[PDB]
Structure formats: structure tokens, C-alpha cells
Design a protein around this nucleic acid. Sequence first.
RNA 1: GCCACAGAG
Lengths: 90, 500, 100, 13, 50, 45, 49, 438, 69, 102, 50, 334, 49
Amino acid sequence: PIRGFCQRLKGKQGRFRGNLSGKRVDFSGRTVISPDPNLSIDEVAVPDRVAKVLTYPEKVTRYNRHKLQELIVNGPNVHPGANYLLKRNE
Amino acid sequence: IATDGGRICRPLIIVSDGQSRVKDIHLRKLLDGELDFDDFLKLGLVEYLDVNEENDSYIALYEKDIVPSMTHLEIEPFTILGAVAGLIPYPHHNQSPRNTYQCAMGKQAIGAIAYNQFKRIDTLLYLMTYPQQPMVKTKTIELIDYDKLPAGQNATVAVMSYSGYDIEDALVLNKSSIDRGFGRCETRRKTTTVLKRYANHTQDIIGGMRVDENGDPIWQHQSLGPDGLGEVGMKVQSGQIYINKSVPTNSADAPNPNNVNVQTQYREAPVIYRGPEPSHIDQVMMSVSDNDQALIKVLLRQNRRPELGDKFSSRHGQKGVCGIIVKQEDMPFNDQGIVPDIIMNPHGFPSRMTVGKMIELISGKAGVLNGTLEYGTCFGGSKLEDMSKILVDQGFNYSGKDMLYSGITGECLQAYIFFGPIYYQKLKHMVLDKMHARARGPRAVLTRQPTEGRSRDGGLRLGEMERDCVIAYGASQLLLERLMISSDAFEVDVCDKCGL
Amino acid sequence: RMPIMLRSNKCILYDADESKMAKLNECPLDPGGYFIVNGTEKVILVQEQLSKNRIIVEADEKKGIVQASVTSSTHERKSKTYVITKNGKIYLKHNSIAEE
Amino acid sequence: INTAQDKWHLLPA
Amino acid sequence: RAGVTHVLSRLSYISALGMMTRISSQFEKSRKVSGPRALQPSQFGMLCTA
Amino acid sequence: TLKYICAECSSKLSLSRTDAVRCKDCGHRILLKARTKRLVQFEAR
Amino acid sequence: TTNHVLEVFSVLGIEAARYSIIREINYTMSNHGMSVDPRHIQLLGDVMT
Amino acid sequence: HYAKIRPWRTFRLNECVCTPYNADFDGDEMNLHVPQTEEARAEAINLMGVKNNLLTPKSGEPIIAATQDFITGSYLISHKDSFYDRATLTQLLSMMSDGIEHFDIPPPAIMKPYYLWTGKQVFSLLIKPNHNSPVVINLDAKNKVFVPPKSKSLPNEMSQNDGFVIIRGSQILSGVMDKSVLGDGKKHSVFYTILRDYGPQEAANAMNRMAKLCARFLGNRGFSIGINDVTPADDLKQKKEELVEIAYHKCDELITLFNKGELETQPGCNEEQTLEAKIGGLLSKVREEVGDVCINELDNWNAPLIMATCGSKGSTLNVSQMVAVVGQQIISGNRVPDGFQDRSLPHFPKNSKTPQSKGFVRNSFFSGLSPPEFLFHAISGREGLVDTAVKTAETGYMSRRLMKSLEDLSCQYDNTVRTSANGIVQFTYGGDGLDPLE
Amino acid sequence: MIVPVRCFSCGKVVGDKWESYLNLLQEDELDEGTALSRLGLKRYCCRRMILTHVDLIEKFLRYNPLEKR
Amino acid sequence: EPDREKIKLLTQATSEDGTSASFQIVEEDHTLGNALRYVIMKNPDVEFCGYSIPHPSENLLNIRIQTYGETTAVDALQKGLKDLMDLCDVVESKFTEKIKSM
Amino acid sequence: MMTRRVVMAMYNPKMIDDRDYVGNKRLELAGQLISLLFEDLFKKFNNDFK
Amino acid sequence: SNIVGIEYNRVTNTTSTDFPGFSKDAENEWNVEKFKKDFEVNISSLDAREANFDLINIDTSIANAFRRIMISEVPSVAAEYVYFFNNTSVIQDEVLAHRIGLVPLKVDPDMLTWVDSNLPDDEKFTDENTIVLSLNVKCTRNPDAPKGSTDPKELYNNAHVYARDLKFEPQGRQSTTFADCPVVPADPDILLAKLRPGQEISLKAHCILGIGGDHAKFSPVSTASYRLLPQINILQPIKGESARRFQKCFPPGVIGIDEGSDEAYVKDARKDTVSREVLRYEEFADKVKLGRVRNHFIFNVESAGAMTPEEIFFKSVRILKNKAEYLKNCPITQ
Amino acid sequence: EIALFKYRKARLEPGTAIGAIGAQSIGEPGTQMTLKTFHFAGVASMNVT
RNA sequence: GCCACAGAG
Ligand SMILES: [Mg+2]
Ligand SMILES: [Zn+2]
Ligand SMILES: [Zn+2]
């Protein structure tokens, strides 16, 4: 049948249960699972080729200037590196 | 009396006066090559029965279980197993869920598909480089012609807890076994382009190879070739062109009686190899279709290697992923000098009733030592005592429990280890097609949220159950970040006197 | 033009030796029985159905309402007839008929 | 030479 | 009637042999345990029990 | 120049870009691109 | 006592209905060896009544 | 979790953490989100953290503990017949900590012939490596399979098979390590005591040390299951035959007397239910007794019995099914039904209610299954699969209903549970006002 | 499709013992256990290499596009 | 010119005087750690010798030496390496003189 | 006969016939389905030709 | 004290049993004179391919270390790179690359030098650290072949791409380096590939040297293992056909029967693969105690053909001593 | 001291979403539980769910 | 983007 208004507000893939009460998020990654006992019980192992796309937005402070400078110089192709930069004037 | 067509039947051997109607002489005629099953039908030795007819008859299983009150005899018991379940070695010793999982799993095995696979172009194909027939096979394998075109490899398996890396049905491969050619599988994919002729008598042109001012091929077209179709044999990486297509710039037809004879330029609409690891072109084929157009097919291939994540099965279920890849020096070894290839956890046997795998190991060891393929057909096959006698005759333990030496410290293992050849399959569910990462990417035009699927650079769902679980901790800021800040944030203007 | 399945009486592969199988690029260990339509090798699967031209008796425990259903199968049209019990009395039910 | 145990040879035919 | 034909998936020889000789269901969906999905002993040697 | 192979006849033939896709010996219409001549390397590891 | 819920409400009041619900859920859960803490059951009973 | 970067294309987590995830490395697929603002990061690490959440709020029991093959290593180390010399002791001690902590050696348990250390002092040094770590735990607990002592006059300490574990100070004095003491399921484990007395950091350290110990100790001491670990002795083969002969005689006599028509009638059941109850009870008793006989005769260092005693993965019933009679094939809480008219399979006498005709699998898995028994086992397994696949589709709806009802509740700052509209549901949560987590 | 140059687990050069195995099984009509014993194969790792190998390359070579049909 | 990064002495886990220490060795694995364990254990002055590999995906070796008495950790490691070198040389000499006969 | 077996099933519950019994299931093959489709297509073609 | 006992379900006394601190006597301190006096080497057999010898009075860690160095750290040569020139075959390019990689070369590795990988690819390969092989085969039909055509080799001239066709192409100073001893594949009749007429294989292979831990092709040992020497201790003599029963539970060159008293004895326990059968039967239990001797090692080293096995042993012990010296000389980082 | 400390740190911490904890502590056993009907009185004479 | 099946936990 035709996709009416009432059929876009009810159901599993509707809006109230498909895109409001739970919604797809950015900055995620899905992978198969392998054991690693030599890792502490609070530590998950992220592969090298997954951490190069997943990123954390760190704001420069007076305490982490040199570290972020080195991360920016290292670039988006070597693992301890940076992938995007955003400024206040921009 | 039923005369309908569409009923299911089975052939049995009529038995009367306490004697099977097929004597040894009729079996001799069959084994001589004459008196086909049709002839035994005509003489009245075998009869077709449906479940309606079996309701009043009396069927016997073995010859030893004859009573005068029977009417029929089952021709062989292992008819009860199907064709897909026929590969399972000694499945009457296993548990029923194991057989069910093997039936659902063996259809995803990687092996050679047919004798004509390298002239075949399918949408997806997996071929094992070094196939091997199963050492403990079944009469079903000889009948349905499975050993001739196998799928899987015979790995020497030690059943021991090598490290913590091999817990919860995981597996430990050998680095000097993968690199010698174990589980080396190659994958083939197809790319099809049809150069449609539009109503304006304008059609796609494959021509052109871009060259910069330096006079050399550009990096985007390093394997494009002279005509416009990527050359067979050349490597193709992420972000290159192997069919440099071009479509007419006048997308709308609008049939024109005007001249417009020349300067009907084309725009670039190529196919771009945006795969994540390198692939090689192995076939490029061109054809003329039924409507007399141009059809171009390209077969890409990549020779992946076993690593962490790939699945493995044992023909008794017991699926699992590789957990670690240890070097040959760290693996155990025996008096002869052999190291195992795959080590499995002994915690998969108590909870899964997988005694058939153990009997398979002993039968396979007896077979490789004796020199003959050993049957393991269901309800019968080859017994255990004779294989034990062969194992002691060649000079081994009766239960395959050979004494090993731990390569890490050179000491004798304080407990014996189950050691022998087991046949394993490499399944198609591999890590390299399931890795995923999102970051910031494409958005749907109706909801402005992340899209779905790894074929569109999508993200992961955070369903209602996960939302409730995050509520269950008291995490407010995290929920606000997950579902508003980084999912579908939007700046709106609201009039706080009316409210719209 | 019939799309015929492989290894049928009309296909080119009926009783073909291994050399002829080599000439036409076909595998001798090919199960056959699948239609090649539009480049895709489709399979028509055997379907299972309730028995036609016969009788079915069905009953349920808690409700206690027995029934006997018969699937009317003609070469032109198909229908179904129910013989059902209500409050311990037999009645006839049909799709075209309104009540019992 | 031939017994009643090896009666499965009908199945290949 | 819908879903008569399905694509013969080429993954292994046993896979093509197993998609062949398949029997669908007249019941598309079910909810009852021991309903149309139970393995009845009538099925000895007619359909596979594994 | 010869760059294309027909399926059955296996006759090395060329295809000018003003010519229909067809073999010059048999009436079949499959042309496979023959192996190129550029140096391709592989790691045996 | 009745292992029902609405009968106990109709005969003895809502406060007995709470106890009937709590005892029934404790019996059903501890018959299967799950061992849910009784305070969660108390919360459920006092939400429904 | 805290992230660590290792190059092998797969997510890897410690196996003690896989129990709450219900994760099985069988092609399992898990997800990894990354927060963006620092506030959500601090939220996740301080409230959602695995160290801060080692206790499920179901009952307060520990749920992040040792799993399979870690409990086996603990049992094999803490066995009574283990004695390590000094080099093996120091090798294990440096193995469980990677040479990062200072270890002080306790006096040996055997001094005159050779200096030997018991296997329990290894776990004693795991709990308290030196005098700087303040972990001093004191507890007692019962293992999974406990045997009472020879007489009532003794306490539980001197009990046979040493199932009563007592830790005073930091030494483990009596008791072998089992699932009941280092695993999820009981509120008097060792890691639970450490967590409830000294905090989460020492508990995480203890788990890390035990994991690294059991991860590189079983490679220096094997543990394998063969067919020698499943095959039965000479006595079981004839004992099982004698008891099944007696059972078949009994059931045949009762079935003949039922056919004649003078069977006892229950006050609330007809004759069919009487026959069903008698046969089912008799068969279940036969299975249980022959299973007891089979288990008692098995020698030690038979691996599956060690797996049952230790509680890693399995049960006594499973080894009983491997070595002795499989048992009654219960289908929907009843014997094998009548697919045909008055019989199961087209192989068996008409109107026969004999138990080998109604779903008894007499042969063990080691000896192979007969065709009727094979089809009956297939039926039971298929019904197990459908039950597992159907119960989920109702419990998910029930869970969503309960959550969408209860999710507005909270505990305000006056110990009164109030809804979203500040309507009081309880005046003190659970009467006492005590969190079931703690 | 073609016999490996080295055994999967041990490390022997097992490709040599393939054509000789076929020759000895074809001409002398021995039992193939004896054929594996005589060719310097004692560890059963190499025995399973050339006892369970299928010569699929000789079936694949029939269908090549290069030669005349 | 000396190769500095091959071996390190861990500072957060060492003792104040030198009774106990833990070195980290790069580009070595079990095949030398076990030999160092065996040789150092043949000291009457070593109470605790033990090697470990922290992660098989990273090439590293942490060896812990705790010695009671006058002996320090560094001297224990150096004399153990000397003893291992002498032992390998003795095996070399014996093997050569037995090969030379045949 | 229909109501006779209705009465028998009503007298004792043991006379229920299993719905999922294999003898009460019929197997439609590929040829029958192709025949059914060719019938409709041929009659549509004949009507259009008329 | 060092007899590792083999009980029917376990192995006992496996740990090393000598060091100061083990007993109050504080015996078995380190001393070079003790190992000089007690250690022994006995060569049972020495062939062109396989070596069998015995190391006596040495502990298990040292023999294990020798085995690990043999498997993973003794260098050898193999094909690391391939360049393909018009490889028209049904076997894929990378499969032929893999087989060419895992072929064993009969080159002494001392005549080369390690390749510095960080250098650019134009100059990383020189003539002093690279062996260049060339393979050039083209299959064509033979007109005077028999009509039967059952054997594929009669029809076609080069239907088998063997290993021996890998010609050596020297470059530069190698023209005098290997003039007396040319570089050839170690095993001549390896079946590298198969071809049909109309198909051509032409490849240039670059061979470097690396450790065994990088890849299995660099391993210079086909097999390099050891077993502890078994020992049969008969507590009480056996008589009659019971001695025949005792003989049946052993290999046919281990247990013998006397001709003066018809009582069983041991002949040679070196040939006894421990099948532990005699611990089964209760009639012979409590009379024989099978074991191994922990400080007596039977080494068996079979090489692929690259180098002579005692050269492998001496290179292994030399590598271990060099490693020990290298860790000795370098100073500890503060 | 230890008894009073363990009592005072066992109070329900104000702010906890106790309803969510209760809901996911009751629903999950429903996933876990296996059987349906148990014989309480007179074996099969009386049935209770 | 809409339907249909096939699968993975
Ligand atoms: Mg799973
Ligand atoms: Zn042509
Ligand atoms: Zn081998």
C-alpha cells in the first residue's frame, strides 16, 4: 500500500522506533571478535586500520600543544597522526 | 488405494517366508554389471512404498533382525541421512544439533566449484588453491562425486590448551603452515557494463586514456590500457579505473530533427575500484547482447591469506575464528618431529557431544599410517578396534595420545595429547569483508542520519534496547551525545509565543 | 522460446561424453536442472502443499472445535469446503456461503 | 563371496 | 504465488547440490512450537532428518 | 597488432574500433583480452 | 490464598493484590533457579498497583 | 574499555569480559562506538567502566570472572598432587605478572627431601604478591561437587576431595580452585571478596594476574581429551546390560498387564497416564543409577570428569550420556508421540508401547546409535532448537514492555522512589532502602 | 589443484614424490601404502599430502582458451 | 656506536639498591630467555629468575632478576651471559672434535 | 463419509489426523508449475490473436 | 632422580631437577669444568641429507634453544621476488610465485649479504646480495606422438614445468663467484607447473636471504627435532609365551628373548617409540616402568638440500653464542 | 567499624534509575528460563504453570 | 530508493 503519514509513524522501521527512540550514530565500527588474554580486563584491542578512521576531537590547550603538533605533522597515513583540523575563525 | 501423482516414495526389498528376495546370486548379477535396478523392479524384488503404504507393512533394518512377520526390508540405513549431511564422518556418534549445524554450514565451504571454474564468470566465487579430499569419507561422497571436486584441507590437529588465545571454540593456526599454503583461498568478483544506445543514436564510448603534461599515464589510469579496458594481469588498487566509460552529455533524450551533427561531447562516468585491498584483473570479456549492444565483463580476483577472524569448521560443527598465529618454533612436536597445524580447545567436546570428531581423528591417523582412505559412513563404516590394531602395529598409542614436547620450554608435556589428521573447511565469512568504520560520512536526505550498510559507508544502529541499557547506568550526557550531538544535530529557531 | 533446464531431453548436453563436455565448456560434474534466464541461473524449487483430492481432519484441544476440510481441486478453479462443529452440532461452511 | 551384508550395491545403480 | 525461483548460489559443489533438491513451505511464517516445523517420525527416509 | 582471443577458435585477432565485435574465423561473439606485456611483480611471501 | 491476582484484589483489596503478585513472581523465578533479588519484584509489584 | 592498538584486523577483548557480552568466538560480531565530547568520555569511563561494574544488578553476584579453560588451569595448579620446584615456581610467578611486580617467596611446604612449594601457594602469591599490596582476604566457600567428611565429628575442613576452601591472611590453606570460588555464580567468590573489601583496582589486578597465569601455564602442561577419556571399562559394558535387561523385563511385564486390562488407576488420571508415569519413572531411575555407576568407576586424570568436577564447561549428565545410556528422549514433556497409527516408525510391532519403541536410546554415543534412536535424538534436538528460537521472540517483547513501563522511575535525594511526575511509588525502596548491588 | 612443493606442517620437499608415486602405482600395481613407504615418506604429514591430493590441474587444462578446440 | 636501545632497565619496578630489577630486551624471544633463565638459576645467589613475553604481537622480552645478598642484578645478568657464552663455546669445541673423527 | 469421520473424530480424540503428516502433503515439481504458467500465457496469446 | 616416568595416564618428574636452592646440599652449582667433563656427543649416522646424533648430559632448555635457532634463525636463500613476462597459464600468477618462492635452493648462504629494505627499490638489489633465476618455457604439440595419447608427456614437448628449468643468470662479479659451483635448484624434479600447447611461462626471480621467522621458505631445515632416549626397566623377569606377549607390545627390534633361560630382556631402547602399550595389560603391570632420560637427547636434522646438517648445528650454536655476546656487550639503558 | 561501613555504603545511592535496573533484571531471566510446567502435587494430577 | 529470497550471531 501507499506510504501514508500514519504508516510513517508506527512500526519497527517507522520514526518513533526507527529514527527517534533509537538512531544510527556516527563514529562507530563493527568487527568480528578474537581472543586476547594478554590484555588487561579493561582494554579492548582496536586494529591499526580501524583507528586511522575513528577519531577523537581534542581541543588544544596549554598542556597538549607539542603533542598535537607532532600528531598533525605525522599526518593521516601513519597511526599516531591527525586527520582533520578546525579553527576558530573558520 | 491412491493413484495420485506427487507423492513421495522409497524403494525397499520385499521379504517373505523369512528370507530376503534378493539372494546372493542376484547381487552377483548386479556386481557383474547386468540386471540394473529397473530389472530388479521388473522381477518384483524391490518395491516403491510411500508413508501411506508403510503404515500397515513391517520393515526390517538389518538382516539379523528378521522375523516371520516382516513384509519389507530397508535397503540401507544411511538413506536416512541426506546428501548434504552425507559428508559428516560418523554422525551417529555425534549429537543432532551438530549435524544440523553442519548441514547449515557445509554449504558455505570454500573449494573448487566445478571443472570449468576458470572459464566461468559469476557474481561471487571462492576457490581454494590446494584442495584435498576428506581422509575419513563416506559412501555418499563416493556416490555424489564429492572427493573428485573437494572443498577443504587435511590439517594435523593437536587437541590441547596451547595458550589463552584458544578459548571458547577459537583456533590457533601455524605461521609456517599458512605461509606454506594452508587455507590459501582466492576470491573472484564480476563487474558488468552495458553500453546502451539511446534513442538519439548516441552510445557510450570506452575510448581515451588520460595522460598528463609529463607524457606518462596518470596514477588514476595506471592499469587502463590503450583502448579503455583495464589490462589483464596488471595490479589494481583503491581508486583506479579499469573501464574508462563515458556517457553522452545530453541525458534527456528529446529526439531532435535538428542537425546537431558534431560536438556531441561525453561526460566521464567511469567505474572506480573502491575496494579496500589490492585486486588483480584476470579476465576481460566483450560481447554483443541480444538487442545488439556492447557488453563488457571484468573478472577481478584477490588471493587472500588466513589471518585473525577467518572462520573454520570441522564437519561436526565446532566452528570458530582464528585467534592467534604462532610461529613453528613455539608449537609442540612429537618424537618423529611433526608439529601440528591447528590446535583446538578441549572445552568444545564436553558440551557438544562431539565424539564423531575423535573417531574421525583416530580413523584418519590409521588411514594415513596404513595408506588407505577409510570409510566412516553412518550406521556402520569402519570400526574402532581394527583402527586401533593398525595404530599399534605401526607403533603408536591405541587412542592417538602421543607424547609431545612443548616448544616454549623444551619439556615433556605432563599429559598426553590427542594428535591426528582432521579435515577442516575454510568458510566464506572472513574478516576482510566485515571490517567497518564510520567517522563522518554520507547522510540520507530524508532523516539526515547515518545511512545503513557497509556498501554505503554506513554506521551502526543504537537500538531501543541499547538506549534502555544506557539509561540503566544513569548516563545522561553520553545518551545526549550519542543521539543528538553526533547523530542528527540541528539548529532550529523557535518562537516562544506561539510555539512553531 | 522455452527456457529449458540443462540435462533435459532437449538440451545439447543429453548423454554427452567428457570430450564433448570439454568442447562446449561444461562441467561433467554439473548437477543440472536449473534454467539459465537473462544470464542468471535460476532454480525452480519443489513446493509442498496440502493434499488435494483428499480429506484432512483437524482438531484443537482447548477450543474443542473439530473440523474436516477438503481442498476442491479442478483444472480450472480451486476452493475449499469445511465441515465444522459448533456447540456439539455439525454444520457446513463454504467461502461463498454466508453462514452455516 | 557375496553376502547379505553388502546389499547396498543397489543404491549406486 | 510468490518466490517460486531462487538463485543457484555457487559456493561449493555440495552447495549447488543442496540448493537443488529443496522443498519450500506452504506456511510462510509460524509462531507455534511443534507446529509445521516439528520433525515427525513419518519423515523417516522421505526427507532428511538432519 | 594482435590483442584479443576468441573463445573456441583461439585465433589471435585484432579489433579495430570501427569493426563489430566478432571473430574473423567463426561466428562466435566472445573476445577475451589477451595478456598484456607490462612488467608485473608479485611477492612470494 | 489464591495464586491468581485479580481474585485477591476482588476479595481482599489492592494491598493483598500486591502481596499476591510479589509471592507469585518470587515462586516462578526461584522455581527455575534464576535468583532475582526480591527488591526488584517489590518495585514491580508497587508499580503495577 | 580503554583502547590499545594492535595490528590484526579484529577486535580483541579479554576473555573474562566476554561473559556479560554472551560472546562466543564463532564468527561473532561486536560494535565499537567512540564518544566525542570530554563529558561523555568521563561519563563512560567512570560509570560505565568494566572495573567499576563487575557486579550485575540481577542479584549482586560477580559476572566478570574466570571463564572456561581459566578455571581448569586454576584447578590443575591448585591440585593436591602438584609440587613445583623453585625454578618452576619463579617461572610461573614471573609469568603471571610479566616481571613488573616485586615478589617475595614464602617458606616451602616441603623442606627435608627437596624444597617444594604447593600449588596453592602459587595462588596465594597471586592474591598478595608482596607486603606493599594490602590485599588480605579471609573467606570460606564450597566447591561445585562437595563430599561430606568421613564422620560428623569432623568439620568441613577435612572433607574428602578437599571441596571446602579456606583463605586466611593471604594463604590458601585448604581447597582446590573451582568455578564456585573463582567464577561467576556465587556471592562468596575470591574476586567478589576483594572487590567488596578493597575496591575495584585490586580486583582488576588479581584477575589480570590470574588470566596471564592460566594463559601461559597450560602450554607447559597439556590437557587433552581423547577416546581413552570417553571409552568405558570392562565392568560398565556388562553392568549396563544387566540393568537394562532387568528394566526391559519390568516394562514388558507392565505393558503386558496393561494390555490384559488390570492396571492400577490413579485417582486423577486414566490408564494411559499411569502407564506413561510408570515407564518414565522407571527409565529415569535406571538412567540415573547406571550413570552413577559409570561416573564412580572412572579413574582420576580422566579429563571430562575433571571438567565436570572443576565446573569449567559441562556436567555429570553429559559424561553420562557419552559413556552410559543416553536416556529418555523427552519430547514436549512426554514420550515419543504417534506420528503413525499406534507406532512411531514403520519398523516396530503394531500397538507396541515398549520403551525401545517409544524413544529410549540404550546405546551410548561411544558405541553408536541405532536408526530409531537416531531419529528420536534428531526430534529432541530439533525441538530444543525451536524452543530456543521461539522463546526469544516473546521475552524480547516482555522486556520492552517492562522497560517502557519502569524506565521513568528514579530515586530522589530523600530515599523516596518517584515517577516522572513526582508521584511516589514507594516511600523507601524495598522497605529496607538497601541497593541489591552492594 | 597441483601438488604442493612443501608439506603443510613438516617442511619436506614432497612435490618430487608425486610423479614417481603415480608411476609406481600405475606400472608395478602395488598397494599405495607401500608406494608411500618406498619414496622416503615416513612422517604421516607428507603421507597425507600425496595420499589425499586430487589432480584437478589435469582436468582444468582441458578447458584452456589458448589452444585450438 | 654501541646499540643503546637493545636493552633497558625498568625504573618503575626496580629496587632502590639493586636487589631486584627487571630488564627489557628487544629483538629477542623465548629461544634466549629460556637459556638465560637456566644459566642464571645455576647461581647460588639468585632467588628469582623469570622471563616473560608480554604480547606475542610485539617483539619484546621482560626478564626479572631478584637476588638476595651481595650480588646485584646487573652483575648477575652479565655473568649469566658470560656463562652462556662459555657453554656454547664448549659445545662448539666438543662437537667439532667429534665431527673431525668421522 | 465426510461427516462420518467427523463423528468418529468427535467420539474419541485419538481419531485426529495430523495436519503435518507427510502423506497429507503433495509435492509440486518444476514441470507442473511451468505447465500452469504456459497455460495462462498461451490463452492470453490466443485471446490477443483472436 | 632424572628418569621421567611414563605412567598410563600421566608423565612424572618432568621438571628440571638440578640447581642451587633445590635442596639443602646446594649441589649442582655452575662450573665450566663439570660440563666439559660430563657432556658428550655421539653421531649415530651422517648422510648427505639427514644427520642423527646424541647430546648427553645437557639440560632441556639448551637443546630446545638449539632447535628453535635451527628452525627460525639460521639463514638460507629462497625466491622473494618474481617478475612475470607474459605468463599465460591456467595456474594463477601468484600460485606460481608461491611455488617458486618455496623451492629450495642449493646455495651456501655465506656468499651473500642481507638486503637493506629501507633503501629505494632501484638500488636495493645489487649483484652481491641477489640470485637471479630465469624460467622460459613454451609448450607446443609434437607431430609424431602416438595415437593413444594416454600419457600426456608423449603428446607435448614441455608439458611439465619442472624445477630444473630454472636456469641461473649470473650478474656482475657473480660470474666468477659461482663459476666453479653453479647455483641450481636443490631438488631437480619438483613439479612447479603444468602447461598445454599454446601456453608460455617466462619469469625472472630474485632470491634474497632472510630469517625463518619471516616466512617458512627461509627455513634451512626440512625437519630439526629431538626425542628423549627411552628406557625400559623390567622389575621382574618374564617366562614362557608370556615373554612372547611382552614382545608383542613393542617394536620388533626392542625386546628380545633369551636362548639360555627363555627369559625376556631389552635389546635396544633407542628404537622404542613410546606406544605405552605394556601399561595396558594388568598382567604385566607393576613389573615394567617405561620412562625417558631427561638429560639425553636424540637430535635428528634433515635438511632441504641447502646445506649439510652439521653445518646447520654449528651455525645454530654460533648464532646463539653471538646473540649472548651481543647482549653482553651492549650497556643497560638508564 | 566494618559492619557499619558496609551498611552505610549499601544505601541506595540517590539518582539511580532503579526502574531500568529492575526491568532488565526481570526480563533477562525470561530469556534464560528453560521449562514451562512442573509437577507439584500428585505428579500429573495437578498441573501448575 | 521500494519488494522478494538467501544467509551471520
Ligand atoms: Mg556463536
Ligand atoms: Zn573465433
Ligand atoms: Zn610433511
